[PDB]
Design a protein around this ligand. Structure first.
Ligand SMILES: [Ba+2]
Ligand SMILES: [Ba+2]
Ligand SMILES: [Ba+2]
Ligand SMILES: [Ba+2]
Ligand SMILES: [Ba+2]
Ligand SMILES: [Ba+2]
Ligand SMILES: [Ba+2]
Ligand SMILES: [Ba+2]
Length: 272
């Protein structure tokens, strides 16, 4: 039994999974006992692209080893992709109840809790990432993200300034940081953080939209109408954006051309 396992493992180490899974099944023909192999068989399906396949083989590991923390975590993950967070949130804590020392799991727990519409709770968990280390750069975002989600902008704008300290390179953050000044009502403060986002990703159509929206508040339809087109050649599919263009040319005093754009918007969603 021993060898059939170590073999399947090296095929796991070449990205060969329906290949590995043959040999893992054969370890588990000889010895169904070793709940290492039951673990890994599920991990060669968490690869080969098979998730409620993986679960069954994790539960059969968690039969024979009921405090395999590593098996709780990845069973949690395997419902998290399938996308059922009732279940993941649970199995992720059955993981932490054993290993409360897991800025991995404590991160992955706020990613489950983030889709319960549930941000007041989901933030407790992210701050259990802060404690272990500030090393995990992604998660600095998802904090401020969840503060942005509760209309709680002043706070959000702090945690992207920490996000961007760490990776100045992420235009995701740059974008969202310019959005928290779009609500919290500080606009040419927003523009210049949308500009620092396009610098990094110029085919971001929504940077062009919400930067071009930010001049629209401050009256400046000279320059707002510019960016609204920069947006629309990069996505002609928008309804309330050919709309927002025509609303902008309506103020330029300019009805002849401002009408054509509303009809553009009316081809696509006529209902509204
Ligand atoms: Ba195949
Ligand atoms: Ba498949
Ligand atoms: Ba299913
Ligand atoms: Ba299925
Ligand atoms: Ba253990
Ligand atoms: Ba203010
Ligand atoms: Ba101004
Ligand atoms: Ba100002």
């Amino acid at each position: 039994a021993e060898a059939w396992y170590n073999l399947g493992n090296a095929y796991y180490k070449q990205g060969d999974y329906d290949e590995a899974i043959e040999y893992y099944q054969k370890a588990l023909e000889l010895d169904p006992r070793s709940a290492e192999a039951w673990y890994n068989l599920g991990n060669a399906y968490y690869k080969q692209g098979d998730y409620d396949e993986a679960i069954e083989y994790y539960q059969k590991a968690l039969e024979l080893d009921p405090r395999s923390a590593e098996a709780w975590y990845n069973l949690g993950n395997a419902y998290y992709k399938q996308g059922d967070y009732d279940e993941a949130i649970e199995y992720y804590q059955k993981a932490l109840e054993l290993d409360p020392r897991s800025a991995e799991a404590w991160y992955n727990l706020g990613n489950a809790y983030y889709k319960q519409g549930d941000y007041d709770e989901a933030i407790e968990y992210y701050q259990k990432a802060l404690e272990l280390d500030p090393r995990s750069a992604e998660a600095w975002y998802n904090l401020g993200n969840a503060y942005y989600k509760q209309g709680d902008y002043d706070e959000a704008i702090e945690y992207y300034q920490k996000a961007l300290e760490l990776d100045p390179r992420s235009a995701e953050a740059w974008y969202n940081l310019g959005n928290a000044y779009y609500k919290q009502g500080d606009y040419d403060e927003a523009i210049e953080y949308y500009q620092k986002a396009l610098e990094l990703d110029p085919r971001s159509a929504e940077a062009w939209y919400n930067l071009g929206n930010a001049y629209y508040k401050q009256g400046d339809y000279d320059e707002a109408i510019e960016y609204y087109q920069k947006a629309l050649e990069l996505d002609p599919r928008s309804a309330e954006a050919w709309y927002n263009l025509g609303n902008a040319y309506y103020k330029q005093g300019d009805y002849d051309e401002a009408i054509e754009y509303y009809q553009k918007a009316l081809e696509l969603d006529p209902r509204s």
